[PDB]
Amino acid sequence: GLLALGTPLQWFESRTYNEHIRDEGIEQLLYIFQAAGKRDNDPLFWGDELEYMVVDFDDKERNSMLDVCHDKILTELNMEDSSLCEANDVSFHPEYGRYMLEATPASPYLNYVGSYVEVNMQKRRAIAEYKLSEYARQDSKNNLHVGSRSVPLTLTVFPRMGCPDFINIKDPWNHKNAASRSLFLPDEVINRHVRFPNLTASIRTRRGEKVCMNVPMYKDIATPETDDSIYDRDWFLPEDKEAKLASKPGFIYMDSMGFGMGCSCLQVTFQAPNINKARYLYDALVNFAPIMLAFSAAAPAFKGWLADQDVRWNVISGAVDDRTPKERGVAPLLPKYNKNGFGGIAKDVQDKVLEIPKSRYSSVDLFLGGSKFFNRTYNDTNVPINEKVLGRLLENDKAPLDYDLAKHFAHLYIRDPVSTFEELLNQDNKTSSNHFENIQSTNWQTLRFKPPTQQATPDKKDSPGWRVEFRPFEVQLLDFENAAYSVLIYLIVDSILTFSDNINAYIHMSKVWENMKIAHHRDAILFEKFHWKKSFRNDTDVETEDYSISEIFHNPENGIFPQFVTPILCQKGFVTKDWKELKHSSKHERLYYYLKLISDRASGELPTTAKFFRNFVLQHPDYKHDSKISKSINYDLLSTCDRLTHLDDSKGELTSFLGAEIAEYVKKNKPS
Numbered sequence: 133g134l135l136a137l138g139t140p141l142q143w144f145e146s147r148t149y150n151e152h153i154r155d156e157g158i159e160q161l162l163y164i165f166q167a168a169g170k171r172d173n174d175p176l177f178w179g180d181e182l183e184y185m186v187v188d189f190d191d192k193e194r195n196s197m198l199d200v201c202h203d204k205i206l207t208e209l210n211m212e213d214s215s216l217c218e219a220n221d222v223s224f225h226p227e228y229g230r231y232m233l234e235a236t237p238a239s240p241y242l243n244y245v246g247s248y249v250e251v252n253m254q255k256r257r258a259i260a261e262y263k264l265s266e267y268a269r270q271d272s273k274n275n276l277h278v279g280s281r282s283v284p285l286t287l288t289v290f291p292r293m294g295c296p297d298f299i300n301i302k303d304p305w306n307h308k309n310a311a312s313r314s315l316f317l318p319d320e321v322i323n324r325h326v327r328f329p330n331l332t333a334s335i336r337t338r339r340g341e342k343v344c345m346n347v348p349m350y351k352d353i354a355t356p357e358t359d360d361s362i363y364d365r366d367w368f369l370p371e372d373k374e375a376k377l378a379s380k381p382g383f384i385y386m387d388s389m390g391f392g393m394g395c396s397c398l399q400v401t402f403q404a405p406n407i408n409k410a411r412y413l414y415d416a417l418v419n420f421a422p423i424m425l426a427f428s429a430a431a432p433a434f435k436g437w438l439a440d441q442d443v444r445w446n447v448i449s450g451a452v453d454d455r456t457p458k459e460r461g462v463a464p465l466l467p468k469y470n471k472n473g474f475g476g477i478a479k480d481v482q483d484k485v486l487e488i489p490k491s492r493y494s495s496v497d498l499f500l501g502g503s504k505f506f507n508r509t510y511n512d513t514n515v516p517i518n519e520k521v522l523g524r525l526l527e528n529d530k531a532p533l534d535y536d537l538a539k540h541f542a543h544l545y546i547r548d549p550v551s552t553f554e555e556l557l558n559q560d561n562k563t564s565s566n567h568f569e570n571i572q573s574t575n576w577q578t579l580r581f582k583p584p585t586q587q588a589t590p591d592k593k594d595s596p597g598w599r600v601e602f603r604p605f606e607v608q609l610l611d612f613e614n615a616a617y618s619v620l621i622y623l624i625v626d627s628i629l630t631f632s633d634n635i636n637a638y639i640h641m642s643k644v645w646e647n648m649k650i651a652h653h654r655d656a657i658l659f660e661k662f663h664w665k666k667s668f669r670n671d672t673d674v675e676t677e678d679y680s681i682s683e684i685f686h687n688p689e690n691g692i693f694p695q696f697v698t699p700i701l702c703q704k705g706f707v708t709k710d711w712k713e714l715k716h717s718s719k720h721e722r723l724y725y726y727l728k729l730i731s732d733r734a735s736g737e738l739p740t741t742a743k744f745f746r747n748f749v750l751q752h753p754d755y756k757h758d759s760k761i762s763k764s765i766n767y768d769l770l771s772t773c774d775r776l777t778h779l780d781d782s783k784g785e786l787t788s789f790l791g792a793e794i795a796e797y798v799k800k801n802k803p804s
């Protein structure tokens with residue numbers, strides 16, 4: 133489904149309704165609860181979301197660019213080609229990036245669907261490729277993008293983002309980018325749907341300074357002292373003057389939403405039997421998030437540089453961080469512009485501003501509790517709340533909520549709305565959840581607790597129930613990797629729900645936040661250590677020790693395989709003792725190779741995508757020992773990515789990247 137249009141409101145015009153929107157949205161929340169609160173027995177439907185990047189290989193120029201010109205695809209697949217999609221059980225939606233695709237199954241999977249995940253993901257890829265080859269045919273006849281070859285790649289990061297000649301538009305700086313006002317990203321990186329440039333503007337204005345994301349550079353032998361791509365400019369005030377102050381020696385400087393939301397990830401959503409189970413599942417998936425973030429790492433480079441981290445998360449965290457310097461407890465960089473650190477916050481409300489520690493895109497703040505093992509002391513972190521909102525969720529005549537669950541919403545509501553259409557100002561709170569969806573959906577966290585709609589009353593057995601979204605996974609090049617990780621979380625989720633009586637996953641939130649920073653460090657999967665529970669089978673216990681990813685996956689006591697994966701395969705009867713038995717199974721071979729891919733990366737035998745791209749850059753003939761990714765390095769890299777994506781072992785790169793056994797296996801074995 134394509135996002136439907138309207139009159140967007142710019143920040144100065146919109147900010148006067150922040151409070152109207154919040155009130156009305158809570159009201160809607162209340163109705164959702166009153167109507168759907170008592171759903172029970174919802175089945176385990178679930179599905180993934182994939183995100184893709186259309187890359188234009190200009191082979192003759194030896195240049196890989198982001199393709200910002202075939203974006204009609206997203207409308208085509210949703211109008212005249214919406215039937216191809218449906219026939220095929222796939223669905224396409226727009227994403228921040230004009231070069232980006234997003235796609236899901238058209239219907240959620242029900243329980244264990246085997247290789248069908250991968251099948252469905254491959255159909256998504258084939259359809260994009262199909263339409264692209266169509267455009268290539270039309271273009272040829274219209275004499276357009278000559279020498280050009282567009283391919284969709286599930287990259288987490290585009291390695292040359294905001295670097296010279298990184299988009300397939302001639303002379304993109306010959307006009308101004310009023311939306312980002314970025315030094316590096318022409319606004320053509322933004323998807324045309326009004327919502328996206330709106331968000332981009334609203335945050336910058338609210339903030340009163342460009343977003344700013346500094347990423348530690350890798351320290352090669354000739355690496356410059358500073359990010360020498362910073363330049364001075366006079367299009368925009370204050371923005372063009374901000375760089376000198378905001379940047380830092382030994383740090384990749386990035387200054388635009390697209391650096392973050394122009395990144396891709398894998399997401400999986402799950403429906404629990406009911407709100408109570410959903411709380412329990414959400415809570416228990418909290419510490420999986422930073423672990424899977426480390427495990428899945430696929431983004432070792434930004435803005436032309438090898439970074440000294442392997443994942444996207446902090447970059448996306450900064451890319452939409454609407455916090456004024458007031459909200460961050462820091463000096464404005466340009467005080468005559470950003471008046472008293474309040475940026476765009478209306479005068480009449482500056483007095484009710486709070487120091488807020490985390491970007492509205494950031495790791496979960498609070499366990500929701502409501503289950504045997506939960507105790508409020510686990511929420512041991514700084515989490516500012518909207519007390520009016522808490523008040524009203526505690527004391528109202530439609531759905532009085534428990535304190536813990538009230539606090540979660542109360543925390544989401546410390547944010548202002550950042551894109552609102554004029555049409556939409558007054559809703560019927562009994563039927564619309566749009567206003568709440570405004571705040572719900574611009575709190576982008578590692579999980580998301582998804583209420584349903586007011587229309588999802590218990591008698592309606594088919595409407596979406598109470599869901600948990602697992603958001604941290606970096607996205608992988610191959611549909612096999614992404615299916616594998618999708619099934620991993622599926623199994624974990626199933627385990628969790630099947631043994632809900634016996635699994636205590638709680639740990640102090642503060643260790644989770646720490647985990648979330650460890651998870652960024654370069655080669656983290658290979659050696660760093662994380663706070664993980666000592667035992668899950670054990671009421672009244674919340675000890676952690678510090679384990680490696682290898683341990684966290686494989687420890688008999690508290691490992692993901694022996695504690696989560698292996699047990700649920702037993703009660704389903706896929707094996708009797710051990711997951712490895714699958715290698716020999718008739719009905720279930722592919723599952724073996726998923727889990728083995730998973731195992732072998734956790735134990736460091738097989739590399740992460742992040743590792744593999746790093747090695748690749750580091751040993752490229754044109755590599756200059758200075759952390760620089762040149763057009764050429766980028767081109768050959770993305771060329772490998774293309775072949776890898778297609779199981780093309782002609783240069784032994786697949787064997788090199790998945791090892792012999794698995795490479796052979798997938799080369800010789802297509803899904804279901």
Ligand SMILES: Nc1ncnc2c1ncn2[C@@H]1O[C@H](COP(=O)(O)OP(=O)(O)O)[C@@H](O)[C@H]1O
Pocket residue numbers: 177178179180181225236237239240399400401402403595596597599601
């Ligand atoms: N009943 C359901 N239970 C769980 N997950 C579902 C259900 N229906 C759809 N999904 C999945 O929810 C995800 C939401 O898709 P999307 O429209 O991209 O929303 P968002 O961007 O809010 O995650 C998809 O992966 C989809 O297949």
Ligand SMILES: N[C@@H](CCC(=O)O)C(=O)O
Pocket residue numbers: 183227393395396397444448576603
């Ligand atoms: N592309 C974002 C996900 C944002 C979204 O689509 O909800 C990420 O890497 O997390």
Ligand SMILES: [Mg+2]
Pocket residue numbers: 181225234
């Ligand atoms: Mg989506």
Ligand SMILES: [Mg+2]
Pocket residue numbers: 181183227234
């Ligand atoms: Mg998405």
Ligand SMILES: [Mg+2]
Pocket residue numbers: 181399601
């Ligand atoms: Mg999602």
